[PDB]
Design a protein around this nucleic acid. Structure first.
Length: 595
RNA sequence: AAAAA
């Protein structure tokens, strides 16, 4: 009777799987009663958390997934939105159930928005915001696919892959004079089911007539009342639909049993396109195509008159040749049956963005970035003065290379209660492998940021107000997209990270590193509670006085490395617990404080 | 509560 119940006995009662989920405050929070499968979820602690429902809709399209993550091998810094989506898609697959966040993706989307233009102006309206407006997910669906294709032509070895999947060659006939009209053809990424004037189809009905109308329609309203005829003669791989209907049409639509057609067939014969349920309903005079429902995003108005989005998704798993359906809440994930996934009888469910895909193309396996040859030439490049030596080609990091990482952050926004923002400023990675070059960093970069910073936390983070493009401390000022890649490549190769409180840093840098690569000195030196400060451990276990004054990540990363070496000394010799219980006992005497 | 910042 817990939250994972996705089917209530009555139609009016929304199951707890669709209810509002409480935000994760950051501290101890287990999602075992929330998600118990490989497919991860996205925490809702972002500005406009409705976009996560769309991200997971595109995540499970094999043609969409394999391309966005595929661009991660090449260096693509100018195309911000396409590569952050690849960082997100790659992370959600590498987590294998663990929670993920789209804060880095949404940060680029907000910064890109600050600049036809009316399409992006609306995307900012729903950012700082009844929490979901009307036809707003469809407008984001337009803006995302439009911005991805526009950026897909700016990568190296320019690709046109997203156009060959979402391409809708749409003819737009505008008739001003008789026998003298004007036509325009432009590639559209998705279909838009606009306000239907009338339903002339009383036949013995499913969604298929609605797609046929959007593919060949005649509009007799303009301004002069011009007659326009829009028709598309292209059947792409993936069909992206945007349902924008009326409540009168949304009430009669629930009576139609099995209105959401799972699989259908259809080709082009005349200047229009006809779609049938079975292949026997229409013998193809030419090449025929079969489309299956890859997934859709539904709007849910709960019993408390609140509203949010969910995502239904299929996946192949060719071992059994079946199809596993999946409802996706924020971090709630449930494996549901196909009958419950297609039911439109419930008055609280409203289809928003539907996606059909090619049958033979849906079965395509999801390829990871590890199957490619990745370009690691960012570590060896140059993208006050910091004393650090760049690595060399004989220092090639392998699976097991030790590195010391410590990041520094600044504050952006207050709690704003009835936590919303925090920014990355500077990270520093140190050499951890024994040798001549030991304990010496190789990247000390300052992340640039244009947003107004509330507090810099100069006492807790060594970032003076010198972090912006024109005026700065002349340090290694760098963009967030590229400094992320340096961290991402080390996790990709299998590098082991050491530091103090790494589980908190990676959450704000928006990257998930497995437990086999994280050596947190806070966890090793932890009693039952009361995590010890780095200044204290550097004083009670070593003979150095750190943290006196303003912090500095290159100092915290260097001492967190030798703490791991001091932990290894007390680990080889069976003294480990004798020191742990001694610092805790002596910690009560000094109250964890000493000048 | 504490670390982290």
């Amino acid at each position: 009777s817990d939250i994972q119940t996705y089917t209530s006995i009555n139609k009016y009662e929304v199951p707890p799987a669709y209810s509002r989920l409480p935000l994760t405050s950051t501290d101890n929070f287990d999602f075992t009663p929330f998600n118990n499968t490989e497919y991860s979820g996205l925490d809702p602690d972002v500005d406009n958390h409705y976009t996560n429902a769309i991200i997971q809709l595109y995540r499970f399209i094999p043609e969409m997934f394999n391309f966005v993550v595929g661009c991660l091998k090449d260096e693509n810094f100018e195309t911000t939105l396409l590569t952050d989506l690849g960082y997100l898609f790659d992370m959600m697959e590498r987590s294998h159930g663990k929670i993920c966040s789209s804060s880095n993706f949404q940060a680029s989307l907000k910064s890109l928005t600050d600049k036809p233009q009316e399409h992006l102006e609306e995307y900012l309206e729903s950012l700082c915001i009844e929490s979901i407006k009307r036809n707003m997910p469809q407008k984001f669906n337009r803006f995302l696919l439009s911005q991805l294709i526009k950026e897909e032509a700016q990568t190296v070895n320019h690709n046109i892959t997203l156009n060959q999947c979402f391409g809708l060659e749409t003819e737009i006939r505008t008739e001003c004079s008789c026998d003298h009209y004007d036509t325009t053809v432009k590639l559209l990424p998705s279909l838009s089911i606009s306000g239907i004037n009338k339903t002339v189809i009383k036949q013995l009905q499913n969604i298929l007539p609605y797609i046929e109308y959007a593919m060949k329609n005649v509009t007799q309203k303009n301004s002069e009342t011009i007659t326009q005829e829009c028709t598309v003669k292209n059947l792409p791989s993936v069909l992206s639909l945007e349902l924008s209907l009326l409540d009168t049409e949304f009430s009669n639509i629930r009576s139609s049993k099995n209105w959401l057609t799972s699989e259908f067939y259809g080709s082009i014969i005349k200047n229009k396109a006809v779609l049938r349920s079975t292949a026997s309903e229409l013998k193809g005079t030419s090449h025929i195509f079969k489309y299956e429902l890859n997934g859709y995003v539904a709007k849910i108005t709960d019993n408390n008159n609140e509203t949010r989005l969910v995502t239904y998704v299929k996946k192949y798993n060719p071992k059994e040749n079946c199809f596993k359906w999946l409802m996706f809440n924020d971090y709630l994930v449930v494996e549901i049956t196909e009958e419950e996934a297609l039911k439109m009888t419930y008055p609280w469910k409203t289809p928003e963005i539907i996606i059909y895909c090619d049958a033979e193309e849906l079965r395509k396996p999801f390829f990871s970035v590890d199957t490619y040859s990745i370009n690691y030439d960012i570590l060896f490049r140059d993208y006050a003065r910091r004393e650090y030596k760049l690595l060399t080609h004989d220092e090639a990091p392998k699976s097991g290379t030790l590195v010391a990482i410590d990041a520094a952050f600044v504050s952006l926004q207050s709690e704003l209660c009835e936590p919303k923002r925090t920014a990355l400023a500077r990270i520093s990675i140190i050499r951890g492998e024994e040798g001549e070059l030991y304990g010496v960093p190789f990247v000390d970069d300052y992340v640039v940021n244009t947003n107004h910073i509330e507090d810099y936390l100069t006492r807790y983070s060594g970032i003076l107000p010198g972090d912006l493009d024109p005026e700065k401390s002349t340090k290694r000022l760098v963009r967030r997209n590229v400094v992320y890649r340096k961290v991402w490549l080390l996790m990709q190769l299998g590098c082991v990270f050491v530091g103090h409180g790494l589980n908190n840093d990676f959450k704000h840098i928006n990257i998930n590193v497995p437990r086999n690569q994280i050596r947190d000195t806070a966890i090793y030196f932890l009693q039952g509670k009361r995590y010890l400060s780095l200044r204290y451990l550097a004083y009670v276990l070593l003979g150095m006085n750190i943290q006196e004054g303003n912090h500095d990540s290159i100092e915290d990363a260097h001492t967190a490395l030798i703490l791991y070496k001091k932990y290894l000394h007390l680990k080889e010799k069976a003294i480990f617990e004798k020191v742990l219980n001694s610092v805790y006992e002596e910690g009560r005497a000094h109250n964890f404080k000493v000048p």
